């Protein structure tokens, strides 16, 4: 047996979290975010700009979404808010 855990992410959900992949269009390079349905979109870029270090603009830049080739600006719509999972491939764009 094994206690349970099935109640907490110790067996309840899969890994209890996931990652994200970003793509820099117009530049053709790529970077990925390590986050969950909790990172603010306005945080997805920071969590990303924060990951990098060559001093990249924060809000000025934008993430192009291959799903609808649109852009993610407001944080009010977290990835999860949109219903995004780890099967969501993001992009980066000016």
UniProtKB/Swiss-Prot annotation:
Top-level taxonomic group: Eukaryota
Triggers of expression: By serum in lung fetal fibroblast cultured cells.
Consequence of changing residue 40 to A: Abolishes lipid-binding via the N-terminus
Localization terms from the record: Cytoplasm; Cytoplasm, Cell cortex; Cytoplasm, Cytoskeleton; Cytoplasm, Cytoskeleton, Stress fiber
Free-text comment about domains: The FERM domain is not correctly detected by PROSITE or Pfam techniques because it contains the insertion of a PH domain.
Family statement: Belongs to the kindlin family.
Record function comment: Scaffolding protein that enhances integrin activation mediated by TLN1 and/or TLN2, but activates integrins only weakly by itself. Binds to membranes enriched in phosphoinositides. Enhances integrin-mediated cell adhesion onto the extracellular matrix and cell spreading; this requires both its ability to interact with integrins and with phospholipid membranes. Required for the assembly of focal adhesions. Participates in the connection between extracellular matrix adhesion sites and the actin cytoskeleton and also in the orchestration of actin assembly and cell shape modulation.
Record's subunit section: Interacts with ILK. Interacts with FBLIM1. Interacts with ITGB1 and ITGB3. Interacts with active, unphosphorylated CTNNB1. Identified in a complex with CTNNB1 and TCF7L2/TCF4. Interacts with ITGB1; the interaction is inhibited in presence of ITGB1BP1.
Record-given protein name: Fermitin family homolog 2
Encoding gene, per UniProt annotation: FERMT2
Residues of the full protein shown: 1 to 94 of 680
């Amino acid at each position: 047996m094994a206690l349970d855990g099935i109640r907490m992410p110790d067996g309840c959900y899969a890994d209890g979290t996931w990652e994200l992949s970003v793509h820099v269009t117009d530049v053709n390079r790529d970077v990925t975010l390590r986050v969950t349905g909790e990172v603010h979109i306005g945080g997805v870029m920071l969590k990303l700009v924060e990951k990098l270090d060559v001093k990249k603009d924060w809000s000025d830049h934008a993430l192009w979404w291959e799903k609808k080739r649109t852009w993610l600006l407001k944080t009010h719509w977290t990835l999860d808010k949109y219903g995004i999972q780890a099967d969501a491939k993001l992009q980066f764009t000016p």
